[PDB]
């Protein structure tokens, strides 16, 4: 679709980055975002960094958004998707972390669809 190819192909502008920061800020303020605000503490999960290849967290993405790290929206979505995929990979489905990744990813998808619609019209 128009938004699909534009997500893959259209380079991010300074205007887009205003939308990326807003989406991220709305995630950081969500009540179920508490496990993803900062990197996982390895004292809380000893084997986490031995099994998770590419860890990710909202503070790392905030730094990358600040430094204009992302060139395409797909790269931004890929980093965010890693946060939730890493969580559901390491934790059981009845874990509070797992449940948070399910709620927050749905919330992110709602906000991402709003951002994609604002770039095209
Ligand atoms: C297994 N596992 C553990 N903790 C997670 N988040 C998280 C990050 C930081 C803090 C407090 C910071 N000292 C608490 C929880 C995730 Cl996401 C996870 O999967």
UniProtKB/Swiss-Prot annotation:
Residues 11-115 form the Bromo domain. Ubiquitously expressed, with highest levels in testis. Present in kidney, liver and brain. In the brain, highest levels are found in motor cortex (at protein level). Phosphorylation enhances DNA-binding. Highly susceptible to proteolysis. It is found in: Cytoplasm; Nucleus. Regulatory subunit of the ATP-dependent NURF-1 and NURF-5 ISWI chromatin remodeling complexes, which form ordered nucleosome arrays on chromatin and facilitate access to DNA during DNA-templated processes such as DNA replication, transcription, and repair. The NURF-1 ISWI chromatin remodeling complex has a lower ATP hydrolysis rate than the NURF-5 ISWI chromatin remodeling complex. Within the NURF-1 ISWI chromatin-remodeling complex, binds to the promoters of En1 and En2 to positively regulate their expression and promote brain development. Interacts with MAZ. Interacts with KEAP1. Component of the NURF-1 ISWI chromatin remodeling complex (also called the nucleosome-remodeling factor (NURF) complex) at least composed of SMARCA1 (isoform 2), BPTF, RBBP4 and RBBP7. Within the complex interacts with isoform 2 of SMARCA1. Component of the BPFT-SMARCA1 complex at least composed of SMARCA1 (isoform 1), BPFT, RBBP4 and RBBP7; the complex is catalytically inactive and does not remodel chromatin. Within the complex interacts with isoform 1 of SMARCA1. Belongs to the PBTF family. The second PHD-type zinc finger mediates binding to histone H3K4Me3. This is Nucleosome-remodeling factor subunit BPTF.
């Amino acid at each position: 679709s128009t938004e699909d190819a534009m997500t893959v192909l259209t380079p991010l502008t300074e205007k887009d980055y205003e939308g990326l920061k807003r989406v991220l800020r709305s995630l950081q303020a969500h009540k179920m975002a508490w496990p993803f605000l900062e990197p996982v503490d390895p004292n809380d999960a000893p084997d986490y960094y031995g099994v998770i290849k590419e860890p990710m967290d909202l503070a790392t993405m905030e730094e990358r958004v600040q430094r204009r790290y992302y060139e395409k929206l797909t790269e931004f979505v890929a980093d965010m998707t890693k946060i939730f995929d890493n969580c559901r990979y390491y934790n059981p489905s009845d874990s509070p972390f797992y449940q948070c990744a399910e709620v927050l990813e749905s919330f992110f998808v709602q906000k991402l669809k709003g951002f994609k619609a604002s770039r095209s019209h």
